[PDB]
Design an enzyme around this catalytic site. Sequence first.
Site, PDB file in Angstrom:
ATOM      1  N   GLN A  21      28.896  57.871  90.566  1.00 13.73           N
ATOM      2  CA  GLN A  21      30.066  57.100  90.941  1.00 13.73           C
ATOM      3  C   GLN A  21      29.951  56.403  92.298  1.00 13.73           C
ATOM      4  OE1 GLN A  21      33.768  58.888  89.823  1.00 13.73           O
ATOM      5  NE2 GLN A  21      34.952  57.454  91.086  1.00 13.73           N
ATOM      6  N   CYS A  61      31.432  65.990  82.353  1.00 15.18           N
ATOM      7  CA  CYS A  61      30.648  67.139  82.791  1.00 15.18           C
ATOM      8  C   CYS A  61      31.419  68.091  83.709  1.00 15.18           C
ATOM      9  CB  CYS A  61      29.370  66.658  83.457  1.00 15.18           C
ATOM     10  SG  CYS A  61      29.653  65.367  84.691  1.00 15.18           S
ATOM     11  N   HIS A  65      35.100  62.776  84.877  1.00 17.04           N
ATOM     12  CA  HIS A  65      33.716  63.092  84.605  1.00 17.04           C
ATOM     13  C   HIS A  65      33.721  64.154  83.518  1.00 17.04           C
ATOM     14  CE1 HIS A  65      31.319  61.259  87.951  1.00 17.04           C
ATOM     15  NE2 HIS A  65      32.553  60.912  88.299  1.00 17.04           N
ATOM     16  N   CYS A  85      26.935  59.532  83.201  1.00 16.24           N
ATOM     17  CA  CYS A  85      26.519  60.415  84.258  1.00 16.24           C
ATOM     18  C   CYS A  85      25.008  60.635  84.081  1.00 16.24           C
ATOM     19  CB  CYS A  85      27.303  61.714  84.137  1.00 16.24           C
ATOM     20  SG  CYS A  85      26.524  63.134  84.932  1.00 16.24           S
ATOM     21  N   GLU A  86      24.229  60.330  85.116  1.00 18.00           N
ATOM     22  CA  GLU A  86      22.784  60.464  85.029  1.00 18.00           C
ATOM     23  C   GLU A  86      22.319  61.895  85.074  1.00 18.00           C
ATOM     24  OE1 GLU A  86      21.318  59.819  89.652  1.00 18.00           O
ATOM     25  OE2 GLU A  86      21.411  58.080  88.303  1.00 18.00           O
ATOM     26  N   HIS A  87      23.137  62.843  85.545  1.00 20.57           N
ATOM     27  CA  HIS A  87      22.693  64.238  85.628  1.00 20.57           C
ATOM     28  C   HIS A  87      22.781  64.997  84.282  1.00 20.57           C
ATOM     29  CE1 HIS A  87      23.713  63.274  89.918  1.00 20.57           C
ATOM     30  NE2 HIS A  87      22.413  63.588  90.009  1.00 20.57           N
ATOM     31  N   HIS A  88      23.856  64.808  83.506  1.00 19.61           N
ATOM     32  CA  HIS A  88      24.043  65.524  82.243  1.00 19.61           C
ATOM     33  C   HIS A  88      24.028  64.643  81.005  1.00 19.61           C
ATOM     34  CE1 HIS A  88      25.837  68.337  85.148  1.00 19.61           C
ATOM     35  NE2 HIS A  88      25.459  69.295  84.309  1.00 19.61           N
TER      36      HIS A  88
HETATM   37  N1  LIG Z   1      28.237  62.889  93.887  1.00 21.29           N
HETATM   38  C1  LIG Z   1      28.159  62.915  92.553  1.00 21.29           C
HETATM   39  N2  LIG Z   1      27.792  64.040  91.946  1.00 21.29           N
HETATM   40  C2  LIG Z   1      27.712  63.929  90.599  1.00 21.29           C
HETATM   41  C3  LIG Z   1      27.988  62.795  89.818  1.00 21.29           C
HETATM   42  C4  LIG Z   1      27.734  63.146  88.459  1.00 21.29           C
HETATM   43  C5  LIG Z   1      27.328  64.451  88.460  1.00 21.29           C
HETATM   44  N3  LIG Z   1      27.326  64.940  89.761  1.00 21.29           N
HETATM   45  C6  LIG Z   1      27.075  66.320  90.175  1.00 21.29           C
HETATM   46  O1  LIG Z   1      25.689  66.556  90.226  1.00 21.29           O
HETATM   47  C7  LIG Z   1      25.547  67.989  90.348  1.00 21.29           C
HETATM   48  C8  LIG Z   1      24.337  68.454  89.592  1.00 21.29           C
HETATM   49  O2  LIG Z   1      24.221  69.836  89.967  1.00 21.29           O
HETATM   50  P1  LIG Z   1      23.312  70.921  89.304  1.00 21.29           P
HETATM   51  O3  LIG Z   1      21.872  70.535  89.347  1.00 21.29           O
HETATM   52  O4  LIG Z   1      23.737  72.218  90.035  1.00 21.29           O
HETATM   53  O5  LIG Z   1      23.857  71.025  87.809  1.00 21.29           O
HETATM   54  P2  LIG Z   1      24.813  72.060  87.064  1.00 21.29           P
HETATM   55  O6  LIG Z   1      24.697  73.434  87.628  1.00 21.29           O
HETATM   56  O7  LIG Z   1      24.535  71.924  85.561  1.00 21.29           O
HETATM   57  O8  LIG Z   1      26.245  71.436  87.356  1.00 21.29           O
HETATM   58  P3  LIG Z   1      27.721  72.031  87.444  1.00 21.29           P
HETATM   59  O9  LIG Z   1      27.754  73.208  86.448  1.00 21.29           O
HETATM   60  O10 LIG Z   1      28.654  70.933  87.095  1.00 21.29           O
HETATM   61  O11 LIG Z   1      27.969  72.552  88.872  1.00 21.29           O
HETATM   62  C9  LIG Z   1      26.879  68.601  89.868  1.00 21.29           C
HETATM   63  O12 LIG Z   1      27.634  69.173  90.936  1.00 21.29           O
HETATM   64  C10 LIG Z   1      27.600  67.397  89.252  1.00 21.29           C
HETATM   65  O13 LIG Z   1      29.020  67.465  89.280  1.00 21.29           O
HETATM   66  C11 LIG Z   1      28.435  61.620  90.508  1.00 21.29           C
HETATM   67  O14 LIG Z   1      28.873  60.613  89.969  1.00 21.29           O
HETATM   68  N4  LIG Z   1      28.472  61.760  91.882  1.00 21.29           N
HETATM   69 ZN   LIG Z   2      27.133  65.325  85.044  1.00 21.76          ZN
END
Ligand SMILES: Nc1nc2c(ccn2[C@@H]2O[C@H](COP(=O)(O)OP(=O)(O)OP(=O)(O)O)[C@@H](O)[C@H]2O)c(=O)[nH]1
Ligand SMILES: [Zn+2]
Lengths: 84, 84, 83, 84, 192, 192, 192, 192, 192, 192, 192
Positions: J125, J155, J153, J84-87
């Site tokens: 994804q 995360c 996921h 996952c590129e976000h976390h």
């Molecule tokens: N469409 C799609 N979405 C994806 C991924 C991988 C991750 N994500 C989503 O990116 C969002 C990041 O949000 P953010 O900045 O608010 O972070 P944070 O408040 O820390 O998150 P969280 O506490 O979980 O809400 C989250 O919703 C996460 O689920 C993917 O593959 N496809």
């Molecule tokens: Zn993530």
Amino acid sequence: MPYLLISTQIRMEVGPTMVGDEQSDPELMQHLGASKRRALGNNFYEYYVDDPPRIVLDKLERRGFRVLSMTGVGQTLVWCLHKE
Amino acid sequence: MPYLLISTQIRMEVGPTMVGDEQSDPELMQHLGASKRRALGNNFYEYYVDDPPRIVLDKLERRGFRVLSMTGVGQTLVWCLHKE
Amino acid sequence: MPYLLISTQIRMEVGPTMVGDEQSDPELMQHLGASKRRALGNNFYEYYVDDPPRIVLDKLERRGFRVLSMTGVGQTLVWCLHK
Amino acid sequence: MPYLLISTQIRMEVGPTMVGDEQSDPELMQHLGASKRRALGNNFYEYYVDDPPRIVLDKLERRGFRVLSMTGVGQTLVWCLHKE
Amino acid sequence: PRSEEDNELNLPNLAAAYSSILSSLGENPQRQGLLKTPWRAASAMQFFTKGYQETISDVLNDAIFDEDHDEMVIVKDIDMFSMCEHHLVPFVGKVHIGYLPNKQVLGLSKLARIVEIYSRRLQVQERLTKQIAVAITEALRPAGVGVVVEATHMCMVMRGVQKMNSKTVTSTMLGVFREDPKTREEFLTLIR
Amino acid sequence: PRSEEDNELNLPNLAAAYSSILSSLGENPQRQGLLKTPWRAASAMQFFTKGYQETISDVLNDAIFDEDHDEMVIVKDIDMFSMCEHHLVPFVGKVHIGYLPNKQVLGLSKLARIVEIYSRRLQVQERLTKQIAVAITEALRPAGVGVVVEATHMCMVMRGVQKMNSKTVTSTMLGVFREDPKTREEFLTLIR
Amino acid sequence: PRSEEDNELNLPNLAAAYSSILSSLGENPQRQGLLKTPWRAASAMQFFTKGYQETISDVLNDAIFDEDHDEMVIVKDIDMFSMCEHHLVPFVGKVHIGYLPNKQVLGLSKLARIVEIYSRRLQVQERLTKQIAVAITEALRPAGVGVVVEATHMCMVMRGVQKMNSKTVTSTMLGVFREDPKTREEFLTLIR
Amino acid sequence: PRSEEDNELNLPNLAAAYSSILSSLGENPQRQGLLKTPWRAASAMQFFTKGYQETISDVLNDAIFDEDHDEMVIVKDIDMFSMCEHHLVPFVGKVHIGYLPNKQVLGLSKLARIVEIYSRRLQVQERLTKQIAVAITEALRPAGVGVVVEATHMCMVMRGVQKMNSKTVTSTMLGVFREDPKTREEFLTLIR
Amino acid sequence: PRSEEDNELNLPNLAAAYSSILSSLGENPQRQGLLKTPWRAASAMQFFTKGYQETISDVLNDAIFDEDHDEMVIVKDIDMFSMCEHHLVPFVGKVHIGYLPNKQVLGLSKLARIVEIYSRRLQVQERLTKQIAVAITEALRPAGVGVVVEATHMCMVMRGVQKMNSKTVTSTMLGVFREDPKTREEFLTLIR
Amino acid sequence: PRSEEDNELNLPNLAAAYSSILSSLGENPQRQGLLKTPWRAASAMQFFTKGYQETISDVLNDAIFDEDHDEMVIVKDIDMFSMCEHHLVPFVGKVHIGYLPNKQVLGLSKLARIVEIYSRRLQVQERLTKQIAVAITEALRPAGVGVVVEATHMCMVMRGVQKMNSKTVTSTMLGVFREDPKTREEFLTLIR
Amino acid sequence: PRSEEDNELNLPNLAAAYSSILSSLGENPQRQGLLKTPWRAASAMQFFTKGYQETISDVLNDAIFDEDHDEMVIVKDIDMFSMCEHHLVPFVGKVHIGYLPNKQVLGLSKLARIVEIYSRRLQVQERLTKQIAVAITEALRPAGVGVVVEATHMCMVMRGVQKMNSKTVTSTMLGVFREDPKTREEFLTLIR
Ligand SMILES: Nc1nc2c(ccn2[C@@H]2O[C@H](COP(=O)(O)OP(=O)(O)OP(=O)(O)O)[C@@H](O)[C@H]2O)c(=O)[nH]1
Ligand SMILES: [Zn+2]
Ligand SMILES: Nc1nc2c(ccn2[C@@H]2O[C@H](COP(=O)(O)OP(=O)(O)OP(=O)(O)O)[C@@H](O)[C@H]2O)c(=O)[nH]1
Ligand SMILES: Nc1nc2c(ccn2[C@@H]2O[C@H](COP(=O)(O)OP(=O)(O)OP(=O)(O)O)[C@@H](O)[C@H]2O)c(=O)[nH]1
Ligand SMILES: Nc1nc2c(ccn2[C@@H]2O[C@H](COP(=O)(O)OP(=O)(O)OP(=O)(O)O)[C@@H](O)[C@H]2O)c(=O)[nH]1
Ligand SMILES: Nc1nc2c(ccn2[C@@H]2O[C@H](COP(=O)(O)OP(=O)(O)OP(=O)(O)O)[C@@H](O)[C@H]2O)c(=O)[nH]1
Ligand SMILES: Nc1nc2c(ccn2[C@@H]2O[C@H](COP(=O)(O)OP(=O)(O)OP(=O)(O)O)[C@@H](O)[C@H]2O)c(=O)[nH]1
Ligand SMILES: Nc1nc2c(ccn2[C@@H]2O[C@H](COP(=O)(O)OP(=O)(O)OP(=O)(O)O)[C@@H](O)[C@H]2O)c(=O)[nH]1
Ligand SMILES: C[C@H](O)[C@H](O)C1=Nc2c(nc(N)[nH]c2=O)NC1
Ligand SMILES: C[C@H](O)[C@H](O)C1=Nc2c(nc(N)[nH]c2=O)NC1
Ligand SMILES: C[C@H](O)[C@H](O)C1=Nc2c(nc(N)[nH]c2=O)NC1
Ligand SMILES: C[C@H](O)[C@H](O)C1=Nc2c(nc(N)[nH]c2=O)NC1
Ligand SMILES: C[C@H](O)[C@H](O)C1=Nc2c(nc(N)[nH]c2=O)NC1
Ligand SMILES: C[C@H](O)[C@H](O)C1=Nc2c(nc(N)[nH]c2=O)NC1
Ligand SMILES: [K+]
Ligand SMILES: [K+]
Ligand SMILES: [K+]
Ligand SMILES: [K+]
Ligand SMILES: [Zn+2]
Ligand SMILES: [Zn+2]
Ligand SMILES: [Zn+2]
Ligand SMILES: [Zn+2]
Ligand SMILES: [Zn+2]
Ligand SMILES: [Zn+2]
């Protein structure tokens, strides 16, 4: 080129409207404001407009075409027009 | 032979176009550039062209055919033409 | 009797072609070479020919009929003819 | 009242044939031998006859109607007639 | 086609090649457990490749009956064991055959004997799927045919990409099995 | 042990034996699908026997830690791929390993890596099971070891007796896994 | 033992008896579907009783291995097709065999070949179960043996009691499989 | 139709034929376990073919009600036990029936008795399937009927191809079950 | 213990190290997707190691009761998410806890809070299992305790040995759970 | 693409950043269990992002065979491991790929390798799903393509919403897989 | 409608009839186990036919809410216990109800209370299914209703055909549930 086939997916109120194939009249496509593209998954080029079919039908009527038949096939609405 | 039935599968922009059965006019099939074949799984012969239906309709117009009706059945687009 | 309904299942190139019901004109059915039958599972009689629809349409044209409309319903191709 | 819509479910050889809605011409419905009913599951009244569509089309021809179009929708065969 | 005389003739050549393999891998061909392997590996390989010896008409031992019925016939979960022609490793699974006859019905076991003519060869799953379907279509000339092969390729599980849970599904749908949504939905449901 | 130099040398000899096999089976070695097959099959057989190139010391990679964890340690459902030594066909399945440490604990993957040195060779299931259990016993000197190998033999399914549903289970119980009814039952329940 | 010469000699007598049976029921032995039935029925019965043609010595085709792998060896889910001697109707299921070797080990597929000698005869499930266990015991002289047979009897499902879901399980436990509670729990867990 | 007196009359002839079969297979008809077998096998065979004694009109016991119910009626998982007319070995499975009545509704158990008339005979699965479908169609004259037969043929599992996991599925769809995709889809789903 | 002040202080340092990792992998840290990744990954890593901020005494919120119930108390399927201290990749699964009180009883949720103090850290499964068991043993002073952790390690499935179906089970059995065979067998049954 | 020279150059930078992370979390990177963690976590992240080193044409290895096979080809249950590129936490699951060839057929394993080029990267994804579908579409120019990816996921399960049972399903349907209701229902049935 | 006063009045007459049945079956009505059987059997029978004491008006308890929710509302796996009006033996199973509201929405539990009015009566499954569908249609006048009842009939299992595994499925589809394929397919999928 007397025959023409135009189409739209379900929800006739909204476009896009497919107005041609690779061998379509380029001037007629330009007149309709059509763009040429090969959509991902297709092995052919198509001409399309953002307009719903009603706008296209009015535009083509101003070019001598007349709707001969309209049919549904799957989720597609197709019009067969003839220049007359 | 006044009636003619032609067809194409979904994506009217592309062929093949079925233009006949075993008892079709051989000269008309030859004029359209059609080939006769019995596709695997079928117990009947058919005449077909690589051209999309729009090209076939234009060729039939020059031969004295007019589209009376166009319909969809399953994923097939069918045209009923008449010699008039 | 001005109206006529004829039909074929998908693969219009091949028959049978349904050309009538119990109350159809027997002379017209005889002219088309039609046979009457009640297929297993049906609670009604039908007239049919082995010919593909194209042959039937040409025969009906020689009998004064013209195709008004053609439609698909399920896997059936239906023609509505008028004298 | 120039337009008329009639229908039958798949197996065009057999009835019933739907010949009207609540606001249909009562004299025309009476002439066709139609009965009014609200079938279980429907929130509307309909006029129907036991006759297959071919019989109904012949009756409507003697009353000034002509078939403009015939179409399939799901398992229903629909005829659009016009008084002309 | 391959004969039993060909098998007796080529058996010593196959055993010699397998003995050579045993030595080239760094193994001792004279160990207790590796002693009879050249002859056993060679005859197992003749068995995995029987079917080059077979012809459709002989397999179909005139088991074509006149069952004038208008119904779908399915023989499902027929065990299938084949040999991958690229790496020479087994690819194994099941084959589910369906068809709508015309005037001729095949004996149930002969559909499984058609599977055995083609699976007992050096194959690619796609060729095997089509050969089975073409044999049913030509022998019976039915209204429609459906053939579905599901297999695990050792070359994808034991080595290479090593996707241990992956399976290959190949599917041929002809006649009414391709044309009619009701026919294909029914066949796909009844094979489960 | 077998080396990478040993692999490069006699890789053409293995390819030569595989093209000889393709000829001896009645196949045309020059057809599209078989052109690379003698080299692809030889590389495959070298990879299936890569266990010969490994040593228990190197595989353990100094991942033996001195811990006092008085607890049962299980690594279950380790995918296992081996080659039968009687008929050169695969026997594939799973390995479940458990041990009760004394003073030394092994890295979890090191148990799967011990399965790999022995399974990646021409073997017999009984030898394979005993080799895994002795490697663990001699590396850790544990209170007990349990090794269960379940596998499908291709020689019993594609040929011979052709018992398509059969599996072979082999089980080594050493130390407290053998003596204690409570230990053995715990292990056999937790590998399910 | 029954020979192939005996089979050729008795085939016409067996076909005549089956033709007589067709007539004794209300059937027409001259209808298309019953023309070859007297000989196919006779051939199937000879195959179903082929175990009379074999001896336990022939089955043990020098497939004994002096090994001492101190481990439980199980071969589970062996498909078993037998015939009830009381009604001449099939009883079909699975055989799960286990043993703990002393100094010798049997070839894996020979275990299934032992099932074949005894199951391909007119039987009673209890005699079939005992005969498999005795054959292993006398061939290897092992620490112990466990043989479990689960079968569905057609004479209990198709007729008589018509207990559609019933199944018969017979179970032989010899040597350490009888004496040791850990040996018997392990064997019964590992066959499941 | 076959009567109970025909059964009593032919029983000694059937018993004599089964005694002849025991001798022709190499067995001793005088051994304890085989002494009552000719009679028990003759009696079993007559029970397996008791369908020849029944007629649709009788079986239905006037349980045809005039309730005008516009709903799909299904009786699923009806245990079915038939005899293969080609090999005289059982083919057993389940039958799932569905129908859409017009004016006449049948009593639920009579659909299982319709399965009994035709299945308790020497059969082919395709004929069996059509006979159930046609019996329902002629007796009730409904809007539609669907009959799916699922069976394991002992002649494909115990012998011949020995495809131990294969099953034959046959399916008849009449009237609205054939024409309407919604109807066929709902029937196939509700029988799962 | 780690404090919220420590977390605020070290968060920029953790984000800088994650930013460095993105660049060192060949990624463009300035693209939309990676713009917030150094802080999101740093905060996530602090959350995964939050167990260092809590004390077993604070977690047990005076939820120890003096109750005499000599019954086995089990909390099974407690979701567990931890971090491998060797590769810094997750190991996730379930924990099953059983105890037999002798005078003190714990609140049900406090058993999952005990899992959370120790799982939310860089761990080894063996250590995590023991820490859960010692926490209960010391808090309640019971007759015995049973702890079973089942987990999938991403460092064995996603990389390394790449045994995608393998799981690790660790088991601590203390007091009567170790001594009494009825106690251990009961616990191992009720956790399934 | 990323090279082996880049990997040698950036490995020490990745290890140093992981050592810094251990210190920023309050841990001691010098304790036995953490000493090799900077190098192990660094090598793991390089392997997890090894798809950046790959080209779609190098991966394909000229395994496009011009064959005329009018049948559906599915490679299902391909294990997919991604980041996952976000976390920077794993998202893991399965990929099911189906296509209807036009003139060219791809080698079965190359579909799993196309999964690996894109999954072994920092991803979302939906992007991963589209990239797999487009690679097949541009390499073979088929009649249609279908790609379904199901993944957990970490995360979403180990933190954040902490919905432990949830799964994400992404589905791309191109060409006849989008247009034809029969084609889509077939692919969707055969992947389950 | 039947009242509680009618129940108290007829109870001695019902107990006398049940006492007569015990004597007519050959049982001793004076033995310990049968002493209270006439009254227990009489009350049970009154409870089983309590649906006669109810009115669809009172059952709904004005729990009709004027809401424009445009969604499918299903209540599945509603346990159903009814009595066969032919043999006075139970038929038991589940009811799955689904509807598409127009302007009126029914209180969820009232769907189960509608099942209870009609099932607690001497019934035929077809009548019961129709009565539930007609009660939802007349109380709500929705766009569509679907009612699926699945039951085991003790008169088909304990006696008669004795088809132990058979079940009867009855299905009423009204409004959009009959005319729309998307609607019908959704309802049938969601009740699984
Ligand atoms: N469409 C799609 N979405 C994806 C991924 C991988 C991750 N994500 C989503 O990116 C969002 C990041 O949000 P953010 O900045 O608010 O972070 P944070 O408040 O820390 O998150 P969280 O506490 O979980 O809400 C989250 O919703 C996460 O689920 C993917 O593959 N496809
Ligand atoms: Zn993530
Ligand atoms: N369509 C089809 N394809 C088949 C088989 C059997 C095998 N194959 C595929 O032939 C390709 C050969 O590739 P190659 O030359 O690059 O070898 P190699 O480096 O060893 O590859 P790989 O395994 O990736 O390491 C592979 O992709 C393999 O999967 C089949 O039945 N149908
Ligand atoms: N204990 C043990 N035994 C093993 C393996 C692997 C295989 N085997 C068994 O060796 C025997 C070889 O005998 P053979 O010479 O008679 O061969 P062949 O005529 O082809 O046999 P068959 O197929 O029966 O006809 C077979 O019985 C085989 O199953 C193992 O791991 N452990
Ligand atoms: N121990 C054992 N018993 C076996 C078999 C196979 C069958 N049997 C049993 O012999 C008995 C014969 O009884 P009989 O003479 O009364 O016959 P019949 O009235 O036709 O019987 P039935 O109507 O079914 O009761 C039955 O009980 C049968 O099941 C086996 O493997 N092991
Ligand atoms: N359609 C249909 N077919 C049926 C049955 C029951 C059986 N059969 C099939 O008749 C064929 C007879 O073949 P034959 O004469 O060549 O015999 P034999 O060489 O001994 O065969 P086998 O070794 O098994 O192949 C077989 O194919 C058999 O399966 C049925 O219900 N429906
Ligand atoms: N007892 C125990 N062991 C555990 C964990 C978590 C991980 N481990 C194991 O430690 C070992 C470290 O090895 P190393 O330095 O050689 O690393 P590396 O070459 O990258 O390894 P590998 O994965 O083989 O490529 C591995 O075997 C790993 O699996 C746990 O919870 N408990
Ligand atoms: N449609 C419908 N039918 C129902 C019930 C409940 C029962 N029935 C059916 O009434 C029939 C009565 O038959 P009869 O008079 O011949 O009695 P009897 O000899 O005892 O029968 P049988 O069982 O064959 O021995 C049976 O067919 C039974 O199944 C229901 O809910 N829906
Ligand atoms: C194939 C033939 O033309 C006809 O359309 C049939 N279809 C079917 C059938 N039988 C079943 N079960 N399903 C069909 O789709 N019998 C005949
Ligand atoms: C092996 C040692 O001597 C002792 O008997 C132990 N047995 C066990 C144990 N832990 C478990 N989980 N199971 C045992 O059987 N720890 C220690
Ligand atoms: C019951 C007899 O005394 C003896 O103890 C036996 N026990 C057993 C047995 N056979 C099995 N399978 N299990 C037993 O427990 N045979 C004989
Ligand atoms: C049978 C011998 O005396 C000894 O008790 C053994 N038992 C066992 C064993 N191995 C296993 N797996 N299980 C046993 O019960 N090896 C030797
Ligand atoms: C068959 C009749 O003409 C009508 O189309 C019906 N179809 C159905 C029905 N009931 C169900 N459950 N399903 C149908 O498809 N009742 C009546
Ligand atoms: C895609 C091509 O135009 C045609 O419609 C095909 N469809 C299919 C097919 N084969 C299968 N199995 N399924 C299809 O949907 N072959 C050809
Ligand atoms: K549109
Ligand atoms: K087309
Ligand atoms: K047709
Ligand atoms: K109609
Ligand atoms: Zn391969
Ligand atoms: Zn072998
Ligand atoms: Zn018996
Ligand atoms: Zn047979
Ligand atoms: Zn790790
Ligand atoms: Zn009843």
